[model samples]
Target: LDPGLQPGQFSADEAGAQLFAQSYQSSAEQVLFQSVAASWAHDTNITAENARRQEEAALLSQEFAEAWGQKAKELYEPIWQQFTDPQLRRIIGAVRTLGSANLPLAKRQQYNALLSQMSRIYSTAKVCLTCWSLDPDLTNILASSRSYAMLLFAWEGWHNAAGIPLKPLYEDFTALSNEAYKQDGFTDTGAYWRSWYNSPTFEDDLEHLYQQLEPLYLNLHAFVRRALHRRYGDRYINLRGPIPAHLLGDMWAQSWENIYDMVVPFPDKPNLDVTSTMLQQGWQATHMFRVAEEFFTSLELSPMPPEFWEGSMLEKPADGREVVCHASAWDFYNRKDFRIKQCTRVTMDQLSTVHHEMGHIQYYLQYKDLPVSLRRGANPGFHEAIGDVLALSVSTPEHLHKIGLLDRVTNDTESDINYLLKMALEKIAFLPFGYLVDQWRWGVFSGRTPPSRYNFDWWYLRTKYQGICPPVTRNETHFDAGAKFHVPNVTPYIRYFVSFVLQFQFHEALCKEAGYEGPLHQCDIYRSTKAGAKLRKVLRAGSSRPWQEVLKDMVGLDALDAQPLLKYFQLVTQWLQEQNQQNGEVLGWPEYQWHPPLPDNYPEGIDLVTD
Candidate 1:
C-alpha cells in the first residue's frame, strides 16, 4: 500500500483497491473504506501543511493554502459521485456531512486557491492601531489586565481594526460558502449548518439546550451586571441598560468568567490565584505541560506517548517569525502521533488550556486504533468538550490543592460560591456568546442579515442574545464581529458552547463513578482510577457509534441535557439569587429605544419545567 509514502504523495490506485478489496463486507463499506484510505493520505498532507502555515505564516505565499484547497477538493469532491448506489451515497453523504464550511467548486483550482489565500491572509494579518504599533496578542492582556482603559484599548482597537480590511475577503468567503451549500442541494447556509451533525433535529436540539441554559445565563448576567454597576458606578454602566463591552474583561466579552474576581460582590475575599504561584515557582511552558501531564496520570488515563512531546509545537519560535499564537491540538493521520501547537505561557489560564489541548491529545490516543472513518469524536462538540471536562475537574479547589496550587484544603460554601461564580463567568456566560457568533454567521450566509446591516446586525444579535453593548458607539464602517478568530478563521463555534455543557455532564458522570460524596460542584476525580476507566470507554468508541450511544456509555443517558450542568452549579446559582435579592438588583437590562427594538418574535417565557 506504500504506507511509507507521505500523505501528499500517496495515490490509492492498485495497492489501495487491493487492500480494500477484502476489507469491506458490502459495497457501502467498500466505498467508505476506500474513501477513508484516500483521505488518510490527503489529510496527512493537509494537517502538516496547516501546521507549517500556522508556525511560519510570514514565509507562506498564497500558493501554500491554494495547494491544500486543491488537494482537499481533489480528495473529497469525486467521492460524492463515486457511488450511485443509494446506501453507498448515503454513507458518503454521512461522512461528508462532518465538514462545516463547504465552497462550491465550479472551478476546482479557483475554489482551492481562494480558500487557501483567505487562510494565509487571515493567519498573517495583524491588527494595527495608533496606541500600539503592532497589535499585542489580546488574549494575554484580556486574561490578566486590571486596567479598564488597557482592556478597552486592546478590545476595541483589535476588533475594530481587524474586520474592515478583511471585510471583502470574508464577504467573498461567505458567498462562496453559500454557493457550496446550494450546490450540495441545501436551501441555504442555515440548512448546511443544520446538516453538520447528520441529525434531522440538530437545530432543535441546539435550541432546546439554549432554552434550558437561558435562565441561568440571565441570572448570572444580572448578578455580574449589578456587581459591575456597584463597582464602576453609573459612569461606566447604565443601571437598567446593557453593560459596556470593555467592562466584561475579555476582548470579545464572550466569557466574563476570567474577570470574576474583579466583578464579584466581594472583591476583597482572596480567590485562588494560581498564576502567581506558577511565577513564584518559575515554571516555564514545558513545566506547565508537565503539570498537565500529571493531571491525566493522576486520573490513571492513558499517558501520552513520547512522540507527543517530541512533535508538539509548544512555544513561539526563537527565529522571530510572525506565527499564529492561538493554541490547538493536532492528530496527524489519526495516528497516535498527536501534537499540541500553542504559544504556551506560564499562566494558570494557559495551564488549564494546556490540559484542555491535552484532552484532545488524549482523545486521539484513545481512538487511534479505530478505522479512519470512525476515528473522530461522535460530533465536534463531543471532541471539544472532552478536554474541557478534565480541565473542569482538575481546576477544582481540591485538585488544585493536590497539585500544590492552593494553600489550604476546603470545599466549603464560601469557596464553592467563589468557584462557581468564576466558572459561570467563563462557562455559563459563554453559552449565549458561543451560540450567537455562529447565529450571526448563519444569518449572514442565509441572506437573513444582508451586507448593508452587517455591522448593525452584529451588535443587534449581541444585544438581543448577550445583553451587551459596545463601550464606544459603533457604526456599519466597523466589522467588529470579525475580530474574533473564528469569524475570520471560519472555524465552527457552536461546538465550544456544546462542549461547555457536555463537559459538566461528563464531569458529573466521572465523579459519580469515582464515588465522590461531596457537593457536585466540589467533586474532583483526580487519582480516581475508576472514573478514568469509565471515561476511557467513551473515548475509545470515538465516532464508531452515534453520539447518543457514546454519551450513554459515559453518563447512562442517550441525550444531551443541561440538568447535570445545573445540578453541579446549583449552590452557586442559589447563592447568586440570594445575593441579588438582598442587593435589590433586577434580572435583565431595561429597554432602550434604538434603531431596532427587541424582536417581538424573540423566544421567551418558555417554561423550563415543561422540558
Candidate 2:
C-alpha cells in the first residue's frame, strides 16, 4: 500500500499489523518459541528455560560498547563534519564520557570505567526519551537515542567487568524506555489527565516544590557523579553538578568553547529560540531538576498525616494506630542483590519507592472493607494512578499546610492551575512517544535494523513520534552522561500513563462529592473526611479486576470520556498558541503539530494506531 512512501504510513493499520506480527514472532523466537506458547497453560520451566536461552543471545554489557561505538561510527562519521570544533569537542567529550569516565573503585578499574560510561549514557538516553516524548523533534530524539546506544555500551562494559555478556539486556532496556518515556522519553505525554483529575498548578505548588527540593537535588547530583567516579575510577566523566537555570547563559557561553564536537545536525530540527539567558538557564535547570525530582517523588509516599483522614466521609473508623512502610527492592536482601552506589539520589529514590509501595498499603486499608470482590479496577490504571495522584496531593496547598509548609499565596487558583498543567502535560505528551518506542523495538527485534543501527533507529522513531529538534548543546538537557536502566526489570511502566489519566478521574469524583465546583482548588480536594471516606470507600479498593469495572465500582463511573481530556488539552494548546502569537516565541508551542485534529480523531481509541 505504501510502495511510494507517504506521510501516514507510520500510523496506518498495516503498520500496526506488521508491528504486531513482528512482536509476536520476536516474542516467540526469543522466549523459547513453541506451540506451547499458543496455549495459555505452558510449562513454567520451559518458559523459564526459553527465556534463559533467548537472553543468552542478548549482548552482554561489553557487547553494547562495541555495538554502540560501531553505530556511532556509522551514524556520526559523515555528519560530524557539520559541527564546529567546539561542538566537536563536546561530541568527543560525549564519547569519552561513555568510554572512559571516572570511578573510585580500588579494584576493577575497567569495570568502574564501564559503569561510569553506562551511567552517563543511561541519563542522556532517558532525557532523550523525555524530550522526544514531550516534543519528538528529530534532533533531540536522535541525540538522546545515541545516548541509548552509549547506554548499551555502558551496560555491555559493565557486563564485561562481570564476565557475563548478554545482548537481551540492551533490547530489554530499549523496551522498557519505550513504555516509560511515553512520547520519546518526555513527561508531558500524559497531558490528558490534567482534566480528569484536579491538577495542581505548575507555577505555584510545583515550582515551589522544585525550588525547595533544589538544594537536596543539586547535592544529590554531585554526590552521584562523585560516588560513581569514585567507584568507577578514571572511566568516569567526573560531571560537575548540573548548572542552575539562573546561570545558564554564562554557563552556555563558557561551555560553547568545549561543547561543539560531540553532536551532528539533523535537517528537521527546529532552531532553539530563547530571549533571556536567565530564562534559558532556568529552563535547562528545571528540565534536569524535574527528571530527578519526579523520579524521586514517584517512588516516595506523600507525607499525609495519620489524622488527615480522620472523620472524613470515606475515612475508616479510627483505631488510632500508625502503619509503617519499608522500602521494596531496597530492603536488605535487594540491597545485597542490586547494590546501587551510595548517593542521595538513591536515598531519595528509595523514599519515593516507599511511597509507591504505600499506595498499595493505603489501597489495602481503603478497599479491604468492600464487600464485593467483583468491585475493582476499571483497568490497571486504577490502582497505580493513585500513587502519583496521592504524591501530587501532598504537594497541594492544603496538604502542604497540614504539614506546615504554607506560603502567603497558598490559596491562589492560578498557582493550582500551574501545577495541574505541568502534571497533565507530562501524561499527554508521553503517550505517543511510548507507542513509538514499542514500534522501534519491533524494528530492532525484526531485523529491520542491525544492533548497530538500533540507536539511530531510536532517533528516527523518536523524531517521527515526539518532534524533538536536534544538535542539543550547552545547558538544555543533560544526556551527555547516562543513568541506570530502570526499565529493564519492570514491565507495564506504561500503565503509569493510564494511571495518570485515571487518578484525576478519581480526584475529580471525590472533589464533586466533597462539594467542589468546576476546576477544583487544592483545598476542595484536600482536607475533608467526606472526601477521604468517599475516596477510600468508593475509590481506593486496590484490586486488579478489569480496570473499567474497577473504576465503575470505586467511583460509580466509567473512565471519563475523551472529550473532556481533549478539550482540556486544546485549552493548553490554545494558551501556548496565544502566548506565542503575542510574544513571537516558540516555547515549543504547536505541540498539536502532530496531535490528531479534533472530530477527525477525537475519542478515536485508546490504541495509538487506531486513527
Candidate 3:
C-alpha cells in the first residue's frame, strides 16, 4: 500500500508507521479514484464501451490488489508489526494479513478470471418465461402476482436458467479459489471470508444470534403459512410443513415484505403500504429520492453533492438503452462524488431502498478520508446496518405522516400492530435467510456440502431455517442455489443477515440518543442532530478498529445481539403467538417431506391434497 517514503522500512516505529499509512493511502487513493469512477460509469450507463472501461478499471483494481498484497508481505508486515499505534498496526494489518493477496501474479489472475467469468454468466443469464431478466420481469411477477402456477413458473424458469447452467462454473470457481486460498494456509475461500472479521469466534457468534432469533422466525412462518392457506386453499400452501417457495412473494424467499398485503394483521386498519398514496400525490422517482434525502438531512447527515444528483440513474434511461436497475450506491473515492443506481418505482419499499442506498453514500462521506484499506465499514455488516437503521425511522407511521406520505395516523393499537406486522414481514422474515445462505456456502466450502449435493444442501437450509421449501420438488440437476444472484456473482451473504439484525440494534440505540422514551418501533430519528451526529462519529472510524470495538462504540455492546431486534418487534412476535394459539395454529412446521409436483389445474388439485 506504500510507496518510496515514510522511510518506515528503517525506523519500524509508531510515527513512521502512521506516516507510512498516510503516504501509502494517498498514492493508492489516487489510482483508486479513477478505477472506482470508471466502474461507476459502467454501473450507470452499462454500454459496451462502458463495459470495456469497467474491464480496464477492473484490471487496474486487480493489479492494485495483488501489488499491494505483495507489498504487504514484503514491506509492511515486518516493519509495521512493532508499531505503537494499535490503529496504525490494524491499518497495515488489514491488507498484510490477507494471505491470498500475497499470491503470485499469474495465479492471482487465474482465480480472478474464474470469479469474473462466473460473475459475467450470472449478469448475462436470462430466465425464460419467453425470456425474463431478474431486474423487471421475474421480480415483477413474484412481487405482485399470487397465481400459484405462475409463481412456480417464474421460480423454476429462473433456477433452470440461472442455476442449472451455473453448477459447473461454481464448481470450478470453488476448487480454483480454494486452491489459491489453501496456499495461504487457509482451508478454503469460505475460511478466508470468515477471516475478514478478524475474530476467530465470529462463526460461533453468528450461529448464537440465529438461535436467539429462531422462535420469532418460526412464529412468523406459522403465521404466514396460515394466511397463505386461506388465500390458496390447502393443496399448495401447507399448514404443517414448509411453505411453498414461490408463494413467499420474494424470488429467493429471503424477505416476505412484498406479501404484506395478504399477511397484515388488521385489514380493518389502513394498510401501511403507500405505493397508491405516493402515486396519487404525483410522486415521481426524483420526488421519492428527494423525500428520502430530506429524511437524512433532517437528522443532519451529509447531503448528497451536485454530482450525486446529476449522475444518479434513479430512473431507468428513457432512450431505451439497456441498464441493470437493481438498486445500488456508488462511491467514487473522491469524497464528494457519490451516486445511486436504481429504477425507482413510486412505492414505499422503493423509497426505503432510496434511504438504504443513501445510507451507503452517507457512510462513504463520513469515511472517505480514511486510508484505502481502512475506508471500508468496520465490517461489511456495519456498512449495510447504517442505511437500514435510517429506513426504520423513515418507515414509521408517525414519520410517514410528518413527511406527508400518509394523510392520517390511526394512533391506536391495531394500527400500531399493523405497522409492526409489516416490519416483521421484512425484518423478522429475513433472519433465518440471512444466516443460512452463508451456512450453505460455508458448508460447501468446508466440504460438508459439495457440487453433487448443492441443490439438496441449499434446500435443506431453506427448510430448516426459513421453514421454506422449493415450490416444486427439486434435485441435484436443478442447482437451485444458483438462481439467487449473490451465489454466482460471489458476494458474501452473511453480511446481509448481520445487517438485518444490526439495523434494528442501531435503531434502538439511536432512538435512545434522541431522547425518545417510547416503543422502539415508534421512535424516529428525524430532526435529531444528536442521533445524526452520533452515527457520524461511529461511521467516521471506518474499519481502523475491530468491529466489536466499533459495535461497542455505537451501542455499548460487545457482541452481535438480537435483543434490540427482538424488542423492536416484541409486540408483533407476541401478537403472532397469541393469534396462532387462539386459532390453534401450529408454531413450527414439521420436518420437511418431499411431495410430487402439482398438476396444471391445482384446484382440481387443492381437494386431493388437503384436510
Candidate 4:
C-alpha cells in the first residue's frame, strides 16, 4: 500500500511508454494500451491509500496532515514527466499548476500546520451570547431564524471571532502563495489560479461573464434592499443607513435568494417549504439522498452500487470525535466505491445539498473507467456543476410534482414568478459574491490592495460588487474574508460561480434533448433517456478532450456564457423590473467612500510577508 517504497516510478513510466507508443499505432493497439494504463492508474489509486489517508486526515487525526502532504508530494511529482499523450500531459500540467502553490519542503510543514489550525478554528468556533451557546452553522441560523439579534450575533461571532484572529495567518499564507506563484513562472497567484482552466483569456472571459450578469445582480440587489427596508421598517434602515449585513440572512451576502419568504411581496404564496414536508413525512438525511439518486436512475444513468450505500458516512458520527462536517463526495481508490460525507440535517437546503454531493458520486462512477489521467472533471467547475444541474431541475415545481413533493399548481403566473424569485435569490444573487471573493484574493495576491486596507478593500468590494456593507464599522485588523470556509480551506471560489452558470446551461440542454416543450425554466430532464444518453456522453468524456468540446457535445456550445441563465430567469427578471418600478426601488445603495483614500506618499506596503 505504500506507493512511496515500491517501484511505482518505473511501473508508471512503463505504462506511460506503452501509452505513448500506442498513440501512433493501430486503433486496436491504442485501445489495448489505454486499457492497461487505465488499469494501472486505477490500481495505484486503489492500493496507494491516498483516499483512505485523506479521509483519515480529514476525519480523525490533525497530526497526520504533514505526513499526508509529504506522501502526496512524493507519490505524484516524479510521475508528472512520464506521460506522453497530449491529454495526459495536460492533466499533469494542471496538477503541477496546483502543486505550484506549495512552498519549499522545509516551509511546507509550517504551511500544513497553518492549514490544520485554520480548519480547527472554523470547525469548532461557536457563538456564546449571554445565555445562548450556538454552533457556528451560520447558514442554518441566518436562513432559518427570524430574529435579527440572533442573526447579528451569529454573523459577527463567526466572522470577527474566527476570521480576525487568522489575519496574521492569512497574511503569511498569501505571502507564501505569491512566492509559489513566482516560482512557477507566474506574475502572481491570481494569474496562476486562473491558468488552471487552460484558457488563455480566462481573466477576460470572467470579466465578460460578469458584465453580462451584473445588471441582473444589481436589480436583484435593489429588490432585496427595498424588501428589507419595507419589512424591517425605517428604524433598522435609518440607524444602519443601508439594510444591515446581518439582515441579508447569510454570513456572506452570497445568496439572499433563500429568504424570499420574508422579502417577497406575498409570503403566503411562496413555494412550500420542502423541509417541513420532509419533516411531516418523517424523512431522514439518507432517504433524501435516495430520492436524489432516483433523478439520475430515472434518466437511465447508472445506479448507485451497493458498496456506495454500505460505505458512505451519511451522518455525523456519534462517538464524540471531532469530525469535519463539511459535505463532500468521494470516489475512494477511483473505483465504484463512491460515498458522501456530511453531518446531514433534515432541511430543504440539505436535501438539495445531498443531490449536489450525489452528483459528484455519479460523475465519479461515469469517469472511473477512464485512464487515470482522464479520470477527472472536464474542469473543476464541470465536476461541481453536474449535481447542481440536477438540483436545479429537481427544485423546479414540475420535478417536485413528478416526485409527489407538491400538489400540481394551477396558477402559472404566480407559480412561475415564485419559482423564479427563489432561484434568482439563490443563483442570481450568488453570481457577484462568487466573483468578488477571488477578486479580493487576487487584489491581495497581486499587491494591488494593501494589507492596512484589507478590511477596507474587503468592504469596498462587498459594497461595490455585492451591494453590501457591515452594519457596524470594521477595521483593517479583521480579516473578514477568512470567515468563509473556502478562503481558509484554499478552495477557489470561481468554481462555484462557474458551476452556477454551467448548471443552468446543462439543464437547458438536457431539457431540450428530453423534448421539453414548456418554458425553459420548467424543463426537467429526469427520466428522459435521450437527455441521459447525452449527459452520459459528456460525463464519460472526463478530461479526455477540452471542456469546450465536452460542452459542445452536450449543448452544441463551445463556450461558457450566461445567456441561458438569463433566458431561464426571464420571468423573474421581468417581474423584478416591474416590481422595482411599481415599488420605486433604487438599484443599489448610495455609494460612499468607506474610508478616505490613502495619501500618495503614505507608507505604500505594510509588511504582509509575515504577520
Candidate 5:
C-alpha cells in the first residue's frame, strides 16, 4: 500500500478499436486473473526490473482498496437516510450506482488487471532467478509473502466483528445508568439504552444478541470452508508431507501446550467485586499467545518438502498437501521471540492474533506441493475467519475442560459462566468501536482530520465510545495502538463483528450434527477432549469458494441468523443474575451502599405466586 505511486491506470480497450478481438480478449482474461491475485496479495515491489508492471499492479490495488473503503463509508454514512424518505431515495440511488458501476465491474476489472501484471512480473523464470540471486536465500520474497499474510491476518482479526448482530443486545441505550437529564431525553429512547446490554435483567437483550451472532459466525465459517475448498480443489485433504499438531518442546524450550498455561487466572479477593483492565488485557494476551504458540508449534512440527525448497526462492505453496517447517511470526517469521517482549501485556492478544497468520502457513505447508495458482486463500475474510473460529473455540470452557485446563466439573461451569459474561460484554463494546474505526479512517482520508491529528482524534473516540481512558500519545502510527488498525489501506478489521455473529452459527450446526440440542458451547469442551481431531478435520480446509455453500454442506445450515446467539446471551444473563443473587449471601461491592430492604412496591402482574 505504501509503494509505487506511478498513478498509471488501465481501462478496457476502446470500443471497436484496432486490435485482434480474440487475442485482446484472451490477453485481457489472463491479465484479469493475474491482477486479481496480485492486488489481493498487495504486491508492491516497484524496482528497476518489472518496474512498470509493479507500478501498474500497485496503482490498481491502491485505488481498489481505497475505493472500496470509501464506498463502504458512503454506504454507512447516512445512518438516518433509510428512515427518511428523501434521504432513502438518494441512498438507494447511490447504492444502485455503486452496484452497477464501482462494485462488480470496476473493482473486478481493477483486480484482473493487477493480477495480469503480477503474473508477467513474478511468474517468469527470469524473475525467479533475479529474486534468488539478489538474496541467495530469496528471503525477501519469503518475508514479503509472510508480511502480506500478516497484514491480511491483522485486518481479518480487526474486522471479525465489523458488522454487528442485526438485533443488537440492547434494544436501546437509555437502559444504562447516568440519566437523560443532560440531554433532551433523546438518550432515553432507542439505541441509547444499551446499558442493559449484558445485564441481569436483560434476558431479552441476551436472547437477541446470541441469536443474532450465532448464525453470523456460522455463516462466516461456512464461507471459509467453501472458499478453501475452491482454493485447494481436490487436494484439500492429505498434506503433501507430514502434518504435526503439537510443538517441539526441547528445540523451542517451551511446551507447545505450555502456551495455554501462560494465562494466569487471578484469585479475586474474597468479597472484592472488580476486574482490573490491566488484568483483562493480560489474560487476553496470554489467551491470544496460547493459540499462536500452538500454531507456531504446529509449524515447527510439520515437515517441509525438500525438492521445492531446495532450488527455488519460492517453495511449493502449502495446499495442505505437504507439511512444511515454518518460521516464527516475529519479524515476518524471522525470529522466535517475535518482538513479543515489546508488548508483554498484549502477548496473548498478539499471539492469538497471529493464529490466522499461522493458519495461512498451515495451509501453505499443507498444500505447498500443489500448483502455485491454487495455493492462495480463496477469499480474504473467509481464510481469516477459519483460524479465528478455531482459536476462539479453543478459548471456551468446554474446550478447556477437554484439554485438561479444567479438572473439576464445578470449576468448569463457573469458568464457563464467567467467560460467557466477558464475551457478551465484548460484543457490546466491539460493535461501535469497530464502526468508529471505519468512520475514523474515512475521516482521515476524507480530510476531516489531518494525519498529524489522527492519533489524538482516535484517542478521543476510543475514550468516548469504548469508555476506556487509554493513554494518549502523539504518534500517528502507533503500531500497538488498537486504533492503528483503521488505516484504509488495511481494510477489513471491522469484519470481526461480522464473523462473531457467524461463529455461533457454526457452533449450533456442529452441535446438532454431534447429536446435541443444547448450547453449542458445550462442544467447545468436547473439542478439547480428543474431539478436536474431528473438529480440525472439518475446519482446516481453506477458502476456495463462497463460505455459505461450505457451511451448508458441513453443518446443514444456510446463511447465518441471530436467534440462537440471542438465546445464548439471554441464558448467560439469567445465569449471571442468579449467581450475583447467590453471591449476595457472602459479599458486596465496596463502592456502593449495602441494601438489605426489599423493593417498596411490586409492579402490576407481579409473579410472586410463581416465586
Candidate 6:
C-alpha cells in the first residue's frame, strides 16, 4: 500500500477509523524503522558525510511521519472524542499522541539538517587531553584519573569541542523546533515532549520527586565535597562551596561512582570493586553480556537470539572507526533482529550496564508483536525504568555473588554504609542532573532561556539542582548543553529522571514477589521467576495500555513515587547527615560563582572557557 493517505481513503466513522489505524501502522512501520536505521548508523560511526546521509533519510521519514500524525488527528479526532469502544480509541490515540506538528517540508529538512550538524559535532568532537586527542568517551580520564590537573584538562578540553561551534547551531535549532512544535498545537518543543506523559500533573510530579530527594542529595554532596577537600586540598576544594564539576569523577559529573574511593564510608572495609575480579577472571565484553543473558533466561525470559551476537558492536572498533561509545540497545524494526552498541569495559558498573541495556532489548522483543505505534514503553519512562530496574537487581551483592563476580556479600553495617553510599553517588546524585538537562532544554524550547543566556541558564540550573558548577568560567560562546550527547541528539532526558524513581519502585515490588524481606536496597530478584513473570506482564503491555494502568499491573502503583528510592538509601542518608554534622559541613551551597578562580599553580594556555 502507498504510504501516503488518499482523500477520505478511510472514513471518519468507527469502522473506517479502525482501518485507518491499521494503515497508519503499516505506513509508520516503514518510515520509522528506516529512521531508526539511519540514526543507528550515524550514531555508531559519526562522520560529516554520514551525518548528511542520516539527515536525508530522517527528513523523508519525518515528512511521512509528521504527515501521518497530522492526518490521524484530522480524521480520527471525532472518533476519539465520541467513540466508547476502548480498543479503537486506544489505537487511534496511540497514533495521534505521537504524531508531530507537521513542519513545512523545507523547514522540516532544515530542522533535521541542523540537528545533524550538531550531532556530528557532538559525536566526533574531541579534545587533546594532554596529547591523546581522546574522548567524549572521556570516562577513563575523568573517572579514573587521579591527578587534579589532568581531570581539569579532560573536563575543560572535552567541553571546548562542542561549546563554541555548537552554540549558534543550537540557537537556530530552538527557533526551528519551536515553530515546528507550534504547528503541532504545542506551545513549544518543551510542551510537546511533556505531553507524552498525558498527565497534567507532570511538572508537579517532577518538582515533588526532587524535593523528596534533595535532602538525600544535599547530604551526599556535602559529604563528597569534604572528602574532595581532604584529597585535593584547600587550593582546589572550597569547604562551603559547590564542588567543581571535574572533581565529581565523571566527565559530566552526573554519576560520581569513581570518586567512591575518596568519599566511601570506610576505606578499609571490604569493597565492592568488581573490576578487579572481572580482570582476574579475564572476562571479555561478550562474557558480561552472556551473564546478563543468563539472569533473564533463569527467570524464563527468552534466551537472546543468535542474531544479537552477530549484529552487536560490543567494543570500540579496532580498525580506528569513530563510533559513539555510549551504551544503547537497538531494535531494527525487524522482529527477529535486535542489538546493543557499547564500548564495554570489564568493570562492575559496565556489567550492570550490560544488564540494563539488555533490559531494553527484552522490552523491545516482548512488545514486537504489538502494532508498530504501540511498540514502546507505555510512557517514555516506562521503557527506561525497566532497564534500570534490572540493573538495581544485578548490582546487589547477592546477585553479583551469584554470578561469581563478587567473592562474598559483606553483611556488616560498615560494609552496608559503603555500598549504599557508593550506589547513592551514582544513582541518587544522577536524579537532579537527569532532571536538569531537559529542564534546561524545556526552558530553551519555551523561550524562557534565550540564546544569549544559554550557558548561563545551563550552569544556573546545575547549581540550582545539582550543586555542580563548571571547572572554569563559561559564556554564550560556549554551548555547555551541547557538550552533552542528548542535547545535540534531540533525545528527551526527563524520562531518565522519572525512571530513576520508577526503577526503585519496580525493584521493590519485584523483590517482594521474590519473597525477599529486608531493606529494599539489598533485595535481589535474581533467578526468581515470580519476579520475572511480573516484569514480563508489564513489558508485554507496551504502550497498548496507559502507563499508570501498566504500572499498576506490574507493581501495584498507579502513580510515580520517590519514597522507594528515598527508602532504599535510608542508611546512607542518615550516615551522611551524621558525618556532615560531626565535621561541621554545610548541607547545601550558596549561589556561588559558576567557576573557580585560577589557582596560582594553574598552567596557562589550555582550551578552557575561562575568563
Best by TM-score: 6
Off by over 4 Å in 6: 1-8, 70-74, 94-101, 129-137, 599-601, 604-611
Q: Compared to the true structure, candidate 3 yields what TM-score?
A: 0.92
Model 6, 1-611: lDDT tens digits are 23263323777788887777777776666666677788878877877787777887777666665565667778777567687666567777656653233667687777878987886777667765334434434677787877777678777888887677988888888888878768657889899899889899999988987899889989889888888888888767777778888988787899999888777788877668788888999999999899889888877887788989988889888787777777889987778779899988887778878888998999998999887767888898888887678788777777778878787667889989988998998898898899899989998988888988888899889888888778787777788888888888788999999888898889999999999999898898888999999999998987877888988887777999988887899888898899989999878887476356665565554435321
Measured over all alpha carbons after superposition, the RMSD of each candidate to the real structure, in angstroms, is: 9.1, 23.2, 3.8, 8.9, 21.0, 2.9
- Top candidate when judged by lDDT against the true structure: 6
lDDT of 2: 0.32
Instruction: Write out the backbone clash pairs for model 4.
Output: 257-425, 257-426
lDDT of 1 at 63: 27
Candidate 6 Cα lDDT to native: 0.81
Report the error of model 3 at residue 230, Å.
Answer: 1.5
Candidate 1 C-alpha lDDT tens digits along 72-174 = 3455455545644433333334434422224323433344444555544444555433233122366666766765555566666676666676777777767
List lDDT for all candidates, in order: 0.67, 0.32, 0.78, 0.69, 0.34, 0.81
Using TM-score as the measure, name the better of candidate 4 and candidate 6: 6
Candidate 5 lDDT, tens digit per residue, 475-579? 444322221212312333434444555556655654554555555554442323233333343334433333455556655654545555665566555564454
Estimated TM-score per prediction?
Answer: 0.81, 0.40, 0.92, 0.83, 0.40, 0.94
Number of the candidate with higher lDDT, 2 or 3: 3
| Worst lDDT 10-window in candidate 5 | 243-252
Clashes of each: 2, 130, 1, 2, 99, 1
Clashing residue pairs in candidate 6 (N, C-alpha, C atoms within 3 angstroms): 101-184
Off by over 4 Å in 2: 1-168, 171-357, 364-378, 410-453, 469-484, 521-524, 537-544, 555-557, 560-574, 585-611
lDDT of 1 at 415: 66
Candidate 4's residue-wise lDDT over 310-351, tens digit each?
A: 867677666644555678777654364666777788877778
